[PDB]
Amino acid sequence: HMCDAFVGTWKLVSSENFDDYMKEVGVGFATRKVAGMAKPNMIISVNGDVITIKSESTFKNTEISFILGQEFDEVTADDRKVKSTITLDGGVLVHVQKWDGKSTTIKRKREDDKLVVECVMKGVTSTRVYERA
């Protein structure tokens, strides 16, 4: 029941400072423009210890499956090859991606009827708000 309140299908309803986050990450111009237009569906499900998070949009369809605390390979929507570890910290899913000596952290939290995603790269934060689909 670890992630019960995350499970479901969620639709992006607002984004703030995502272009600057993508710049900080190293995403190039054309990908930033097309990715920034996307209104993804995030689909979260749990089967035993395995959590699956899908992102579906006109830009890309991606999927990760993982066990909390257990590092995995991830190819991101912008085509980074990263090493990821996801943990639960006080009811927040904390997802750290490492690549090329760099690091970014994505936090996913339930707040009221929303799922709030905070993406941080150094000093730059983007906040993406999802509601139930």
Ligand X SMILES: Oc1c(SC(F)(F)F)cc(SC(F)(F)F)c2cccnc12
Q: Report, in Å, the least distance between residue 73 CB and ligand X.
A: 15
Encoded amino acid at 7, one letter: V
Q: Give, in degrees to the nearest 5, the angle at Cα 49 between 83 and 79.
A: 25
Pick the closer one to ligand X by CB: 20 or 88.
20
- The answer to whether the beta carbons of residues 46 and 3 sit under 8 Å apart is yes
> Taking CB under 6 A as the rule, does residue 86 contact ligand X?
no
**Per-residue contact flags (x/-) with ligand X for residues 38 to 57, judged by CB under 6 A:** x-x--------------x-x
Instruction: Specify the stretch interacting with ligand X by CB under 6 A; choose among 2-10, 32-40, 64-72, 84-92.
Output: 32-40
Distance (Å, whole) CA 69 – CA 67: 6
Using CB under 6 A, pick the residue from 7, 46, 68, 77 that binds ligand X: 77
Per CB under 6 A, residues contacting ligand X are 22, 25, 27, 35, 38, 40, 55, 57, 59-60, 76-78, 106, 117, 119, 128
